[PDB]
Design an enzyme around this catalytic site. Structure first.
Site, PDB file in Angstrom:
ATOM      1  N   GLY A   5       0.783  -1.199   0.000  1.00 50.49           N
ATOM      2  CA  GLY A   5       0.000   0.000   0.000  1.00 50.49           C
ATOM      3  C   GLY A   5       0.813   1.245   0.000  1.00 50.49           C
ATOM      4  N   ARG A   7      -8.166  -9.748   6.175  1.00 52.05           N
ATOM      5  CA  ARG A   7      -6.988 -10.455   5.724  1.00 52.05           C
ATOM      6  C   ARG A   7      -6.427 -11.366   6.773  1.00 52.05           C
ATOM      7  NH1 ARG A   7      -4.275  -5.291   2.750  1.00 52.05           N
ATOM      8  NH2 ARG A   7      -6.227  -4.745   1.724  1.00 52.05           N
ATOM      9  N   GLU A  67      -7.719   3.006   2.061  1.00 56.89           N
ATOM     10  CA  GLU A  67      -7.954   1.721   1.466  1.00 56.89           C
ATOM     11  C   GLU A  67      -6.638   1.172   1.000  1.00 56.89           C
ATOM     12  OE1 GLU A  67     -11.054   2.093  -0.424  1.00 56.89           O
ATOM     13  OE2 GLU A  67     -11.167   0.047  -1.162  1.00 56.89           O
ATOM     14  N   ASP A  68      -5.938   0.486   1.871  1.00 55.85           N
ATOM     15  CA  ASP A  68      -4.586   0.044   1.606  1.00 55.85           C
ATOM     16  C   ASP A  68      -3.641   1.213   1.437  1.00 55.85           C
ATOM     17  OD1 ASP A  68      -4.508  -2.816   1.602  1.00 55.85           O
ATOM     18  OD2 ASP A  68      -5.858  -2.698  -0.120  1.00 55.85           O
ATOM     19  N   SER A  69      -3.891   2.310   2.096  1.00 50.20           N
ATOM     20  CA  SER A  69      -3.011   3.445   2.003  1.00 50.20           C
ATOM     21  C   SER A  69      -2.378   3.662   3.366  1.00 50.20           C
ATOM     22  CB  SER A  69      -3.791   4.627   1.557  1.00 50.20           C
ATOM     23  OG  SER A  69      -2.946   5.631   1.134  1.00 50.20           O
TER      24      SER A  69
END
Ligand SMILES: [Zn+2]
Ligand SMILES: [Zn+2]
Lengths: 49, 258, 99, 59, 66, 149, 28, 179, 446, 59, 100, 115, 179
Positions: free
Chosen positions: H7, H39, M153-155
């Site tokens: 990410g 996850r 979001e995945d950051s």
């Protein structure tokens, strides 16, 4: 020709980058970087306006 | 409708950190001082490096970066210099900069620790922190490698680059017992006591105190060497008071001109 | 699958005995029965996982498949045999054999 | 008409990609293979082949 | 490659402690008692010196001349 | 005036199904004179109520005694003498429903005004005469105050 | 004489001796 | 991270702005809690918990896989001897207002990596550049200064929009106009 | 001239799979070098911010600009025609925080209300009356979220945890646990918002806002939610940690007992079959009735222990708060982290006999027991035993294989479909014909 | 570079941590990826059902 | 919108409902025309909506259940047709590309 | 390459005003002050100081984008008090308090040092 | 053998003596189908209700079933297995010092990190992979929180001041040739 060149071409005035979030932009706004804006152009007719 | 009368009480003062307590102030004023300690307190730091010969194993920018992070004792100079962008000169001045100079060649057989002893200043008062404990290693040279550069230190604050950040760590805290329940523990006894907790070892958090505001903000400002830990404070109070006075002048011009 | 020898058996509902096999239904029941069977199959395999597709979009696919009176597959042998005009067939497949 | 990629350029991007590129095996089964049984982790790769390091693309 | 000047998180100067810390470990101090004899309290500053791997000692083996 | 209701209640059961939230608890009071139910949710943290407490609950339509019917915006700087100055817990809500035992032909005898105080519900289930000034979608105040007797 | 529950220290001595003798790319 | 949590950097805050514990330990990296629950990388949290014990003891923790001696009650009992909450949570303060965050945040040292996919090797733009020779359409590739491909799937999505003029501009007027 | 602020672009993630993957946006230029886009829009694009790249086409004429602006702009694309429900909903961090902001016990003082109102673009400058005026003015979660809701909408939804037996009993219109969302006149009266009412479902609150008010008023709705809630979450905070993965040591005992009873139940099925008493089910062989009894026992063990894990979760848990709001995760992720991981299948069966009559060399020939065929009985918090690390990997490889074959096999169905139907359209005759003008349907959709 | 000590790997400008195992071909390091295949000299009875045969004893 | 108060007796003549729904069933035209072939199909294409319309806008539900006033009923009928006329498929719409 | 130079957070360009008052039209007696090249350091002390004024009916501040260096402060007062003088008085006394805090910190230093 | 093997490199005792003395064996996959293998030695060769009591081999360490990039994950057994596969793949893009003579190589495309650190919580088998000598990463103070909204979001959110001080700063080398 017909599938690689006639149904799908490569176009000018495109850009590509990594997306990242910004919750401060409205849902219909995109935040573009400054070099991508300073590269691609829009032809705008001159008028007394 | 008016101001509050804060009171200060230094509990510990060394030459490396200050612990004080501020009472009777708002949380916003007490936290905005905390931010002024970190960003807006001027300090001298190397910011212009001209490399004449570098044959070390490190880069050219690796040396210059590691030289910007060397803290230089700014203490009464830093309030006499000007910012570089405001000096009415061309190519740095003694009145807006301090010049440094490193010239090292390893000739012997053992390796050379280029430390900050080798940075020779042209003002006796702005030196790297070596005065009165080893020195900040810059490179290690081998037999035949060298480094000559000259560098310049100018004034700045930690909002541009962190190299101009005068503090190791500011430890702000208020309300040690959860009296305001600003934080809500799911199991309040698994939590260790604050350092400042006026609470016995029996009870876990203070009983809820419904009408009550924060006061008594506890601070612990720790210097990195560059300024003395009570000068970081006296300078953050003046730097904040000066941001406000400037805003007020520009405001009165906006008001009278409407 | 037989579907014709089964419907004719006694004590077997010859009204609700369906078949899961849209080429069996076509030669037995008709082309207007294939359209209903095809859409029931298509909706079973879509709503199985709980999702929902509007009905308009399944009626339209089952209508183009059964619009010329036989079962038109959605492959190169179903849609290229349709008389659409050569510049449209050369874009799907075969591209020169049709030209 | 030959095999291909039997000999690849060593990956010097970090030491752990060098080391794993040198210990890499290859099952020659072509791509465009819709079969799974050669892509499944067989019980019998226990202790021989790493059961976690595989590429997540089509290989 | 070479000990950072400052702790990334905190700001504290850890550039002058790599030699002192390797000397204390050479003496007899255990590694946790060396790190506070140097005066490193926060665990932010303590991982600078535990985790540091010194590569410049290996890069100095490649002499340009002699 | 504007007193849609007025009575003395006393807490008969506090959060019975179990405590669902932490600063809010259900009080199941009963009345004393008109014999009404109440299901109230109060901010149990800034105004704690324990069982067997008695409070005077005045559901009012306005706060100013003359009944001049304010707008519904908050203005703290105000001189005018209010009814909130003699109470301890004032809320401000919106009656969202009025159920009743109507039948198809004759009228109803027991009403239930459900009002909602910014999220914190209430149900005043009584008989159809004390629940008169209550009509659905109208702004109403709470005004309760504990009797130390 | 046997080695018991003092065995995580001893399970890794034979692993270290294996990796001294044979590198990681010995199979090449 | 060392657990499958990739990410990109999303924004960068100074130090006055990051949240901070009761001494001035601001995070270096703040990841999102929503990356964990679907996850199920619990190893990430156990490592962030043992890295805090390791940086406090002053020696390097052991995370070999199948190991029976390490578990989380044992790491938790050690962490609470250095005066932390045994589960790794801490009480952060807001960096902007200074007020405590009412949830206790789970902070500790984890080993991050920096992957070689930087952005400034991917940003790419075009406005009438060079052109192929056989079919005079823009070149391909970022280094050739090419243009992006408006493939077929992008054309069906423009038919479905009923956008005939944008379709014929992307497929004629900004690609290879001729007479 | 150069592209400047306000231009219309068209923006597109690459596996373009439906109409909402080329929506058009207005340009706002910003410092660093990435395309930056709002978060609700990640759902149509299928975007993800972990290295994804999107393309950006620029229309080059007034006549194409106007057409994009009137046909593909992003607030015009909120409701999809595929399933007649919104494609954009509120979906992370904001959905978790709005479920916590609309709980019944969230009270805010004037200093935080006046700060959350600064992030309302549609606010009219009137501070509402606080829900509590004495002993201290406190506003509420719902009372501030009522200012966001546009217009005078009316909808009724049910929260995620709404007990089914509440609409029957009393307390139907006054709900003990605050489920049952009720909006009336564009005001949240009751209820807690979650994905069932602010997500992308038919009839949610962001759907009613679109059918009732414009697409333009709905554009400001999505933006105000995320801007007020993202600012309150700087006060409330959200995290996840180790503490959120622990049970309560009585739950550990309950689970270990369930698991041991289950391993015991499968031993008796094995005895019965070993002495020929497991009579086949009429429709199955012996090895299928056996495997069915075993998988029933083991699936019951996993479900029971997983449920007894959730019942033990507190309200302050942070797994549970991202499951009840629906933001991320499911009840089967809490159960595998806390309780038991479960049975690892490859191709629908249990782990197969890869060596000769056994699954690994550690077990013994002909071992049908639970541990010997893949039943992982630890959790991710306790860690997996060595054999079941391997079986968990054999299982987890199936998902990676099927993803890589899925991608290429479905992309060809969609292409065959579009070639077979691309020129079917609605004529001014209002009849549905194709390119040869043969009539396909007499009215669209009948 | 064989059996050569560690000062001498560094005197030749090399690293002592290099594993080896690769070729230099026109100044590129190339690795040979190991290819698997079937064991030879061994009888394997399979069963292809998609033909005319019930069984097949390959060797 | 009109503040109904379903607690008071309404003034909506039970016949205004009966005849307003008859007049509204006329304005929802899908198959235009006076031809018998066209009246048949207009009657078919709006058969389920007309049943729904006639089963929720009863005279009895509108008086025992919804309690609509007369003015609210006129607003309601104008609203139903104005929404129905927005639901019609636009001509020009590429429906096979959506179905795929 | 698209990185903004770091002095852009505090240095005013050529033409930018520090501060800019705009009468707000939705409610009476409300203004919006737009400070350029400022952040939560200065915006938070002024707002919390304005909430101490009893004649101030609303005060707040926002930072519209963090990549941009501008805050907005919205003040609404009672009709006998313009928000121009609310904002001025919120600075005058914030200054008087910081100056007094400095005097007291200074004497507490010189008493701690040998005392 | 443990004691003689502890005193290797002080005289000359090695792995080949363990093989020659008849202590370990090289068993392979077609022969592994008739071993009866114990996983750890004490615990599977003790005395209970019997599982087999006819073991013929025993494993050295069970964590030797992982490969090179998978053996640097700490606690891989607490992770969902696809996450361990993604890290096996992302660990080969991690920038770090890729080799020690990197100043002599004229590679196309080298990335090196300025200040790589050793992991604070390591596995025991990343000793042999020589990862603490050429590490690829930095131990950073992660803080699982959901702060401004920018890490959503995945950051992630990084510290600007940490970066000013040299955090994950790296250098990129590209080589051009011509003759
Ligand atoms: Zn000068
Ligand atoms: Zn530090």
């Amino acid at each position: 020709r017909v599938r690689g060149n006639l149904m799908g071409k490569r176009v000018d005035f495109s850009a590509r980058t990594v997306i990242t979030p910004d919750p401060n932009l409205s849902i219909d706004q995109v935040g573009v970087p400054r070099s991508i804006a300073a590269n691609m152009t829009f032809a705008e007719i001159v008028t007394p306006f | 409708p008016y101001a509050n009368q804060p009171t200060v009480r230094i509990t510990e003062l060394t030459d490396e950190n200050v612990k004080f307590i501020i009472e009777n102030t708002d949380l916003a004023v007490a936290n905005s001082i905390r931010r002024v300690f970190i960003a807006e307190v001027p300090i001298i730091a190397i910011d212009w490096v001209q490399i004449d010969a570098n044959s070390s194993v490190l880069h050219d920018e690796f040396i210059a970066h590691r030289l910007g992070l060397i803290p230089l004792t700014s203490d009464d100079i830093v309030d006499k210099l000007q910012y570089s962008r405001d000096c009415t000169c061309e190519e740095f001045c003694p009145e807006c900069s301090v010049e440094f100079t490193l010239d090292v060649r390893c000739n012997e057989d053992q390796t050379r620790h280029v430390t900050s002893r080798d940075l020779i200043s042209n003002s006796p008062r702005v030196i790297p922190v070596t005065s009165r404990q080893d020195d900040i290693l810059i490179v290690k040279l081998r037999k035949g490698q060298e480094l000559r550069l000259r560098a310049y230190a100018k004034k700045g604050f930690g909002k541009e680059h962190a190299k101009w950040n005068p503090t190791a760590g500011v430890a702000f805290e208020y309300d040690p017992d959860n009296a305001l329940r600003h934080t809500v523990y799911p199991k309040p006894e698994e939590w260790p006591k604050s350092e400042y907790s006026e609470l016995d070892e029996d009870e876990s958090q203070a009983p809820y105190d419904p009408n009550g505001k924060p006061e008594r903000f506890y601070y612990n400002v720790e210097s990195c060497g560059s300024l003395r830990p009570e000068t970081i404070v006296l300078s953050a109070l003046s730097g904040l008071k000066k941001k406000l006075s400037d805003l007020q002048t520009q405001l009165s011009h906006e008001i009278q001109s409407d | 699958v037989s579907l014709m020898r089964v419907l004719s058996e006694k004590d077997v509902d010859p009204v609700r005995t369906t078949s899961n096999d849209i080429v069996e239904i076509f030669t037995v029941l008709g082309i207007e029965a294939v359209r209903k069977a095809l859409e029931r199959e298509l909706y079973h395999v879509i709503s199985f996982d709980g999702s929902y597709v509007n009905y308009r979009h399944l009626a339209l696919l089952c209508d183009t498949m059964t619009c010329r009176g036989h079962l038109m597959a959605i492959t190169r042998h179903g849609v290229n045999r349709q008389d659409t005009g050569p510049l449209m067939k050369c874009s799907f497949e075969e591209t020169v054999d049709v030209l | 008409q030959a095999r291909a990629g039997v000999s690849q350029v060593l990956n010097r991007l970090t030491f752990a990609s060098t080391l794993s590129h040198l210990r890499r095996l290859n099952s020659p089964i072509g791509r465009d293979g819709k079969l799974a049984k050669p892509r499944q982790l067989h019980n019998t790769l226990w202790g021989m082949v790493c059961p976690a390091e595989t590429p997540e693309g089509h290989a | 490659m070479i000990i950072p000047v400052r702790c990334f998180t905190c700001g504290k100067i850890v550039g002058n402690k790599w030699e002192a810390y390797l000397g204390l470990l050479q003496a007899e101090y255990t590694e946790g008692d060396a790190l506070d004899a140097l005066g490193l309290k926060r665990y932010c500053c303590r991982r600078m010196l535990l985790a540091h791997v010194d590569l410049i000692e290996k890069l100095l083996n490649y002499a340009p001349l002699e | 005036a504007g007193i849609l209701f007025e009575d003395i209640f006393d807490v008969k059961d506090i959060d019975p199904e179990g405590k669902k939230f932490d600063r809010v608890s259900r009080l199941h009071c009963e009345s004393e004179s008109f014999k009404m139910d109440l299901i109230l949710d109060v901010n149990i943290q800034i105004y704690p109520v324990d069982l067997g407490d008695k409070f005077r609950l005045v559901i009012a339509s306005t706060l100013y005694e003359d009944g001049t019917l304010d707008d519904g915006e908050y203005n703290p700087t105000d001189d005018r003498p209010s009814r909130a100055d003699q109470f301890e817990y004032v809320m401000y809500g919106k009656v969202y429903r009025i159920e009743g035992d109507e039948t198809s032909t004759e009228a109803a005898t027991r009403l239930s005004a459900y009002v909602s105080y910014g999220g914190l519900l209430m149900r005043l289930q009584g008989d159809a005469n004390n629940l008169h000034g209550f009509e659905v979608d109208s702004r109403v105040y709470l005004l309760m105050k504990k009797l130390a007797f | 004489e046997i080695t018991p529950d003092l065995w995580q220290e001893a399970c890794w001595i034979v692993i270290s001796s294996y990796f001294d003798e044979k590198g990681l790319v010995r199979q090449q | 991270s060392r657990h499958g949590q990739k990410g990109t950097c999303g924004i960068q805050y100074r130090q006055e702005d990051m949240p901070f514990t009761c001494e001035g330990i601001t995070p270096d990296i703040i990841i999102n809690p929503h990356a964990i629950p679907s996850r199920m990388t619990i190893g990430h949290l156990i490592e962030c918990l043992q890295g805090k014990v390791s940086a406090n003891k002053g020696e390097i923790g052991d995370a070999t896989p199948f190991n029976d001696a390490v578990n989380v009650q044992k790491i938790s009992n050690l962490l609470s001897d250095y005066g932390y909450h045994l589960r790794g949570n801490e009480v952060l303060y807001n960096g902007f207002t200074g007020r405590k965050i009412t949830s206790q945040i789970f902070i500790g040292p984890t080993y991050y990596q920096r992957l070689k996919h930087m952005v400034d090797d991917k940003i790419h733009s075009r406005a009438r550049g060079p052109i192929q020779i056989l079919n005079r359409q823009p070149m391909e590739g970022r280094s050739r200064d090419g243009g992006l491909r408006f493939g077929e799937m992008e054309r069906d999505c423009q038919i479905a929009h009923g956008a005939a003029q944008f379709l014929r501009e992307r497929l004629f007027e900004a690609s290879d106009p001729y007479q | 001239r150069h592209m400047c602020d306000g231009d219309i672009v068209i923006f597109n993630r690459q596996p373009t799979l439906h109409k909402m993957s080329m929506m058009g946006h207005r340009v706002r230029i910003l410092p660093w070098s990435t395309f930056r886009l709002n978060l609700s829009v990640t759902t149509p694009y299928n975007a993800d911010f972990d290295g994804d790249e999107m393309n950006l086409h620029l229309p080059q004429s007034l006549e194409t600009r106007a057409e994009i602006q009137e046909l593909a702009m992003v607030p015009r694309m909120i409701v999809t025609p595929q399933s007649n429900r919104p494609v954009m909903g509120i979906v992370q961090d904001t959905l978790t925080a709005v479920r916590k902001f609309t709980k019944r016990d969230v009270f805010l003082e004037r200093g935080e209300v006046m700060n959350l109102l600064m992030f309302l673009s549609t606010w009219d400058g009137k501070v509402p009356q606080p829900a509590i005026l004495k002993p201290r003015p406190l506003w509420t979660g719902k009372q501030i979220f009522s200012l966001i809701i546009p217009g005078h909408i009316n909808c009724i939804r049910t929260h995620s945890t709404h007990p089914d037996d509440e609409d029957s009993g009393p307390y139907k219109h006054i709900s003990p646990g605050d489920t049952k969302v009720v909006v009336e006149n564009g005001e949240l009266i009751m209820g807690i918002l979650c994905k069932k009412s602010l997500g992308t479902s038919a009839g949610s609150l962001v759907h009613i806002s679109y059918l009732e008010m414009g697409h333009d008023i709905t554009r400001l709705f999505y933006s105000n939610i995320q801007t007020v809630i993202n600012n309150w979450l700087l006060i409330e905070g959200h995290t996840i940690g180790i503490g959120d993965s622990i049970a309560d040591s009585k739950t550990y005992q309950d689970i270990q007992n369930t698991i041991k009873k289950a391993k015991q139940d499968v031993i008796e099925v094995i005895e019965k079959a070993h002495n020929n008493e497991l009579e086949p089910t009429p429709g199955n062989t012996l090895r299928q009735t056996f495997e069915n009894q075993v998988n029933r026992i083991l699936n019951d063990a996993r479900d029971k222990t997983g449920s007894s894990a959730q019942k033990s979760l507190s309200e302050y848990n942070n797994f549970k708060s991202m499951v009840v709001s629906g933001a991320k995760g499911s009840k089967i992720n809490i159960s595998q982290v806390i309780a038991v991981v479960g049975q690892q299948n490859v191709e629908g069966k249990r782990i197969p006999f890869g060596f000769k009559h056994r699954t690994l060399p550690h077990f013994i020939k002909d071992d049908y027991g639970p541990e010997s065929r893949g039943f992982v009985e630890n959790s991710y918090l306790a860690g997996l035993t060595p054999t079941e690390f391997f079986f968990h990997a054999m299982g987890g490889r199936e998902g990676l294989i099927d993803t890589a074959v899925k991608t290429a096999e479905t992309g060809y169905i969609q292409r065959r479909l579009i070639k077979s139907m691309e020129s079917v359209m609605v004529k001014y005759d209002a009849t549905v014909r194709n390119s040869i003008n043969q009539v396909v349907q007499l009215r669209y959709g009948e | 570079l064989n059996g050569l000590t560690d000062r001498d790997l560094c005197e030749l400008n090399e690293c002592p941590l290099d594993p080896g195992g690769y070729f230099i071909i026109n100044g590129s390091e190339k690795v040979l990826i190991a290819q698997e295949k079937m064991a030879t000299n061994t009888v394997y009875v399979f069963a292809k059902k998609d033909s005319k045969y019930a069984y097949t004893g390959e060797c | 919108i009109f503040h109904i108060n379903p607690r008071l007796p309404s003034d909506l003549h039970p016949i205004k409902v009966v005849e307003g729904v008859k007049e509204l069933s006329k304005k929802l035209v899908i198959v235009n025309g006076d031809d018998p072939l066209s009246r048949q199909a207009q009657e078919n294409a709006t058969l389920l909506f007309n049943i729904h319309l006639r089963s929720t806008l009863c005279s009895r539900r509108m008086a025992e259940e919804f309690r609509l006033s007369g003015e609210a009923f006129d607003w309601l009928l104008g609203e139903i047709e104005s929404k129905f006329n927005q639901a019609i498929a636009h001509p020009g719409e590429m429906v096979g590309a959506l179905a795929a | 390459m698209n990185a903004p130079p770091a002095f852009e957070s505090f240095l005013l360009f050529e033409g930018e005003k520090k501060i800019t008052i705009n009468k707000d039209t939705k409610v009476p007696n409300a203004c919006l002050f737009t400070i350029n090249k400022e952040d939560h350091t200065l915006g938070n002390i002024i707002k919390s100081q304005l909430l101490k004024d009893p004649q101030v009916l609303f005060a707040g501040y926002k930072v519209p984008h963090p990549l941009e260096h501008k805050i907005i402060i919205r003040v609404q007062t009672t009709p006998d008090y313009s928000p121009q003088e609310a904002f001025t008085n919120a600075i005058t006394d914030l200054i008087s308090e910081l100056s007094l805090l400095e005097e007291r910190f200074r004497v507490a230093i010189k008493d701690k040092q040998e005392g | 053998h443990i004691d003689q093997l502890k005193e290797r490199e002080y005289n000359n005792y090695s792995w080949q003596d363990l093989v020659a003395s008849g202590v370990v064996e090289y068993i392979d996959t077609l022969e592994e189908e008739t071993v009866m293998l114990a996983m750890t030695p004490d615990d599977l060769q003790e005395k209970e209700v019997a599982y087999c009591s006819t073991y013929t081999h025993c494993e050295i360490h069970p964590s030797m079933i992982l490969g090179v990039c998978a053996s640097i994950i700490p606690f891989p057994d607490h992770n969902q297995s696809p996450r361990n596969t993604y890290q096996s793949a992302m660990g080969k893009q991690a920038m770090g010092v890729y080799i020690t003579n990197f100043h002599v190589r004229m590679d196309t495309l080298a990335h090196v990190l300025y200040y790589p650190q050793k992991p604070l919580v390591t596995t025991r088998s990343m000793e042999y992979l020589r990862f603490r000598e050429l590490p690829a990463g930095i131990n950073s103070i992660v803080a699982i929180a959901s702060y401004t909204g920018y890490n959503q979001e995945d950051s992630v959110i990084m510290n600007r001041s940490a970066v000013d001080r040299g955090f994950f700063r790296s250098v990129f080398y590209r080589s051009y040739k011509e003759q």
